[PDB]
Amino acid sequence: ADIQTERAYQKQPTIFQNKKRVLLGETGKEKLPRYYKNIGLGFKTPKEAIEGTYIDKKCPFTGNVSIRGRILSGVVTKMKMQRTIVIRRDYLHYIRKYNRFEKRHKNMSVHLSPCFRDVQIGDIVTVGECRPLSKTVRFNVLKVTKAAGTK
Amino acid sequence: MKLNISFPATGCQKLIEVDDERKLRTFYEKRMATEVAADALGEEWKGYVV
Amino acid sequence: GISRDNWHKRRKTGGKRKPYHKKRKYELGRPAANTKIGPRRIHTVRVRGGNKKYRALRLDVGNFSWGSECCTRKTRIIDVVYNASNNELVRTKTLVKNCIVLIDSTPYRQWYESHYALPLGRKKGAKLTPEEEEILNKKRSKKIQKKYDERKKNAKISSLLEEQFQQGKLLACIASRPGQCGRADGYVLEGKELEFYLRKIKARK
Amino acid sequence: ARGPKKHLKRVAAPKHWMLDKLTGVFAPRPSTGPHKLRECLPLIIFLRNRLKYALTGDEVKKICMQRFIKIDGKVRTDITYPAGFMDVISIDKTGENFRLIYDTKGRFAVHRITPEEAKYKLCKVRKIFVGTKGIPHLVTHDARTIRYPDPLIKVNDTIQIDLETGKITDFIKFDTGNLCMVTGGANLGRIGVITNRERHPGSFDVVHVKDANGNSFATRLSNIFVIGKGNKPWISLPRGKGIRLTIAEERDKRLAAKQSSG
RNA sequence: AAACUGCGAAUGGCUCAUUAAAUCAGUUAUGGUUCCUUUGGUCGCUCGUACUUGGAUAACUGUGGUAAUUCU
RNA sequence: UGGUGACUCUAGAUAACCUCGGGCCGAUCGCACGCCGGCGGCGACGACCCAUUCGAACGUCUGCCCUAUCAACUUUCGAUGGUAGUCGCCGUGCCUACCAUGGUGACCACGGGUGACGGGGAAUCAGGGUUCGAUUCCGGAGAGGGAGCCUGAGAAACGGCUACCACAUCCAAGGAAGGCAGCAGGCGCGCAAAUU
RNA sequence: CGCUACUACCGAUUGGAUGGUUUAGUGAGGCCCUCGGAUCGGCCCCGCCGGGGUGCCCUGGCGGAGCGCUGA
């Protein structure tokens, strides 16, 4: 489970990992301090974020992003990108002339932190608005709700 | 060609029109801000540097 | 000129984009500051709002930090050995952020001598240079030697750090952007970061 | 486009200036100042359109350049100077002082005050921050930075400052039961007692206010300006006491006044 | 009066060619930026010729060049 | 110290650095005549930096006309994402290198057309709708067509500059000077629109 | 079906008309030449007597050059 899989060293920029230790008081890797924050609006930090080891600069809990703006929801449809998933948001648009609605949808590419493991296609995810993380990504997954049709 | 000579010590200037090429030959092929001994312009210009 | 706008880019669906205006001044880009190693030459560029950016073109001196000991000194930059973005940024020796550089160890070594109270380390070949052994042996009172001993109690330098200090060079990372601030600062590599970058350089060579 | 605009079309001007459309194409574009463009009152509007002391903008310029107008105790020669909520306008030559207070219809009333009450004003604080060697600071709705404020003064409270010295004299905490004024929105100009505040994290808070006659309304927290402790005001209220009358009672009062007075 | 300096000339006015999630409208964010001016306005917080320092250059005076310019 | 729903916020502390193209902590003016080599009151103008005053810029949550005789589109040329940088005022494939194959579509993608600037809004009232909106307010764009810049806080400015393209003015033929979709006025075009 | 009131498609046509729509080359340009630097500049080694903290030497106009020193 190597973390350093890139050409540059991966580490949380806040945590200093070169502090001097004591020889007689150290036997094995003692601890690596973990940087994590609690995002607002009542969202609880997942356990895997606090006690994990992954490095994600776009993670809402262990990264540099701040959640602000719209809190949305959607269902996972594709998981074929690194730390990024595609969710679909279905809604009904009212046509005034016919007094009726039509089904419409929009796909949003949202960032999924490694603190959410075993997220499946069809799960309901709560996303929060953040700064542009890529060309199309502007939302971060904050909570994953398992689908009713799951194990 | 005409020559616009000035004497900064007195602040006096005089434009003398000369059409005499051999008097101008001493200035040819010399860039600005170069000091040239101007004795060929006239018999009264002896010992003059312009 | 060079533009940083996004409306020249294909849409997320892949469709073509038709511009509604021509290039604006606030969307401009500027040529890179390929900050080589050499005598200090920094050009100043005026930016939006009247502020100033320092476009460093040549640098051989930087303010690097020894994080574990919290000892940052002005040091000379000797070489670049690793770039995590492009190999040609090492071959052409440009100073950019997060690039691994060789720096002198003389200021940190001298501060360590001012720290030195450790037992016999690496003093085999000796130096025999007078007026230098004052900073190691000196004449000192009892409580001053007691303080130096209590400092020696907590002196511990990694073997890789020692091996670098023997050669007179240290591995460091540029934590500043020389093409934007004119300064090539950073910190000396230590610990697992040092091990990782040593493996990277070894595998590259 | 290409830098800031310097004009204001007369029909794009704030509607509470009560400007008419046939006078000209332009309205006096208020200069930058302690109050926002859409919730200020340019000195020319007050001196000409309200007080009728001047007939044209040139006469307003003459009055202002004679150094007769003082806003918050300072002589202001700018005829488009933005004067706003709780600002004190003192004209010494004619010996009258005005306080810019919204009337119940959302417009700046000509509210005359005694010269004793013209020596202070109420300022809602916008932020408190610490800077420059641990020195607390305080920013008001009036864009005034007051150093070394009382540690009990927090955001959304209103302080009372003496105009001559520019120092905090007293303050009122933001709490239920305190009298308040609405400075924006549909309920702008209304005065009542704060009854309940609903907090919406990440969004705007809602404050519920009740009048003296029991009418209850609500507005966003940014629109609340607490006037006094409890139900008594620290400043003098306009001819209407912040009560908004329905159009039926307005018409009834107008008809009764027409009947009684001949 | 001239001329140097400062400021404005990026507002206003005109037109609708381009432009089909582009522009725009309502909503929200900048905790991801800059901001002349206005208004408050850190402005003896640095620990070894100050009773006022220095190349200049316009206007002005004179010599001019070009068929010609708000050229010089 | 003090805040926010949430800071890698603010404040504090130690080690240092601080740009040829340096960096803030003042080398100046205002008619009254006044005080126990000296002090003083009002101002004006500057100037770092903090305060969203005016903004600008960037985020696409939702909403836009006709067309399938347009069904698949994007990925030597970034196409979607990740990592590290460059550049930028800043977030970002914005650009570069490496890595992973993604991303969008019959809930109309992509392509084409529009006698398409968008909106506030305008033309009958049964109710519902159908058309229109170049046009005085708001937003955008452009200054013959492109492109590139200087100055500046702010312009890719055109009653600023520099080129090329198309027109076009004076010339002594060496050269010089242009941009009315500003107000008026001309010509042309026209069914179609005013006073130098 | 031997008359006209009756543009386009097909044109053994490539005869023509504001027609830039992309390859491949060339190529404008704020000269951001790190190869460039006769000119322009208070000491730099002097002419010499402007005059001093000593009509007696830390001097107030470089007359005046030398790819030697530095400066946009």
Curated annotation (Swiss-Prot), chain A:
Gene3D superfamilies: 2.40.50.1000. It is found in: Cytoplasm; Nucleus, Nucleolus. Component of the small ribosomal subunit. Part of the small subunit (SSU) processome, composed of more than 70 proteins and the RNA chaperone small nucleolar RNA (snoRNA) U3. The modification Omega-N-methylarginine is found at residue 68. A lipid is attached at residue 59 (S-palmitoyl cysteine). Citrullinated by PADI4. One of its GO terms (biological process) is translation. Transmembrane segments: none annotated. The modification N6-acetyllysine is found at residues 37, 44, 57. Keywords: Acetylation, Citrullination, Cytoplasm, Lipoprotein, Methylation, Nucleus, Palmitate, Phosphoprotein, Ribonucleoprotein, Ribosomal protein, RNA-binding, rRNA-binding. The modification Phosphoserine is found at residues 66, 109. Component of the small ribosomal subunit. The ribosome is a large ribonucleoprotein complex responsible for the synthesis of proteins in the cell. Part of the small subunit (SSU) processome, first precursor of the small eukaryotic ribosomal subunit. During the assembly of the SSU processome in the nucleolus, many ribosome biogenesis factors, an RNA chaperone and ribosomal proteins associate with the nascent pre-rRNA and work in concert to generate RNA folding, modifications, rearrangements and cleavage as well as targeted degradation of pre-ribosomal RNA by the RNA exosome. InterPro entries: NA-bd_OB-fold, Ribosomal_uS17, Ribosomal_uS17_arc/euk, Ribosomal_uS17_CS, Ribosomal_uS17_N. Its main location: cytoplasm. Belongs to the universal ribosomal protein uS17 family. It holds the Pfam family Ribosomal_S17. NCBIfam families: PRK08572.1 (NF006345), uS17_arch (TIGR03630). It comes from Homo sapiens. Coiled coil: none annotated. The modification Citrulline is found at residue 21. The modification N-acetylalanine is found at residue 1.
Curated annotation (Swiss-Prot), chain B:
It comes from the Eukaryota. There is a cross-link at residue 14 (Glycyl lysine isopeptide (Lys-Gly) (interchain with G-Cter in SUMO2)). It is found in: Cytoplasm; Nucleus, Nucleolus. Ribosomal protein S6 is the major substrate of protein kinases in eukaryote ribosomes. The phosphorylation is stimulated by growth factors, tumor promoting agents, and mitogens. It is dephosphorylated at growth arrest. Mono-ADP-ribosylation at Glu-35 by PARP16 inhibits polysome assembly and mRNA loading, thereby inhibiting protein translation. The modification ADP-ribosyl glutamic acid is found at residue 35. Component of the small ribosomal subunit. Part of the small subunit (SSU) processome, composed of more than 70 proteins and the RNA chaperone small nucleolar RNA (snoRNA) U3. Component of the 40S small ribosomal subunit. Plays an important role in controlling cell growth and proliferation through the selective translation of particular classes of mRNA. Part of the small subunit (SSU) processome, first precursor of the small eukaryotic ribosomal subunit. Belongs to the eukaryotic ribosomal protein eS6 family. This is Small ribosomal subunit protein eS6. It comes from Homo sapiens. The chain holds residues 1 to 50 of 249 of the full protein.
Curated annotation (Swiss-Prot), chain C:
The modification N6-acetyllysine is found at residues 36, 127. Signal peptide: none annotated. The gene is RPS8. A lipid is attached at residue 1 (N-myristoyl glycine). Residues 1-26 are annotated as: Disordered. One of its GO terms (cellular component) is nucleus. It is a lipid-anchor. The keyword Transmembrane does not apply. GO terms for molecular function: RNA binding; structural constituent of ribosome. InterPro entries: Ribosomal_eS8, Ribosomal_eS8_CS, Ribosomal_protein_eS8_euk, Ribosomal_Se8/biogenesis_NSA2. This is Small ribosomal subunit protein eS8. It holds the Pfam family Ribosomal_S8e. Residues 7-25 have a biased composition (Basic residues). There is a cross-link at residues 169, 192 (Glycyl lysine isopeptide (Lys-Gly) (interchain with G-Cter in SUMO2)). Component of the small ribosomal subunit. Identified in a IGF2BP1-dependent mRNP granule complex containing untranslated mRNAs. Part of the small subunit (SSU) processome, composed of more than 70 proteins and the RNA chaperone small nucleolar RNA (snoRNA) U3. Belongs to the eukaryotic ribosomal protein eS8 family. Component of the small ribosomal subunit. The ribosome is a large ribonucleoprotein complex responsible for the synthesis of proteins in the cell. Part of the small subunit (SSU) processome, first precursor of the small eukaryotic ribosomal subunit. During the assembly of the SSU processome in the nucleolus, many ribosome biogenesis factors, an RNA chaperone and ribosomal proteins associate with the nascent pre-rRNA and work in concert to generate RNA folding, modifications, rearrangements and cleavage as well as targeted degradation of pre-ribosomal RNA by the RNA exosome. The lineage of its organism: Eukaryota, Metazoa, Chordata, Craniata, Vertebrata. Its main location: cytoplasm. It is found in: Cytoplasm; Membrane; Nucleus, Nucleolus. The modification Phosphoserine is found at residue 159. The modification Phosphothreonine is found at residue 129. One of its GO terms (biological process) is translation.
From Swiss-Prot, chain D:
InterPro entries: KOW, Rib_uL2_dom2, Ribosomal_eS4, Ribosomal_eS4_C, Ribosomal_eS4_central_region, Ribosomal_eS4_central_sf, Ribosomal_eS4_KOW, Ribosomal_eS4_N. It comes from the Eukaryota. Keywords: Acetylation, Cytoplasm, Isopeptide bond, Nucleus, Ribonucleoprotein, Ribosomal protein, RNA-binding, rRNA-binding, Ubl conjugation. The keyword Ubl conjugation applies. One of its GO terms (cellular component) is nucleolus. Disulfide bonds: none annotated. PROSITE patterns: RIBOSOMAL_S4E, S4. Belongs to the eukaryotic ribosomal protein eS4 family. Component of the small ribosomal subunit. The ribosome is a large ribonucleoprotein complex responsible for the synthesis of proteins in the cell. Part of the small subunit (SSU) processome, first precursor of the small eukaryotic ribosomal subunit. During the assembly of the SSU processome in the nucleolus, many ribosome biogenesis factors, an RNA chaperone and ribosomal proteins associate with the nascent pre-rRNA and work in concert to generate RNA folding, modifications, rearrangements and cleavage as well as targeted degradation of pre-ribosomal RNA by the RNA exosome. This is Small ribosomal subunit protein eS4, X isoform. The gene is RPS4X.
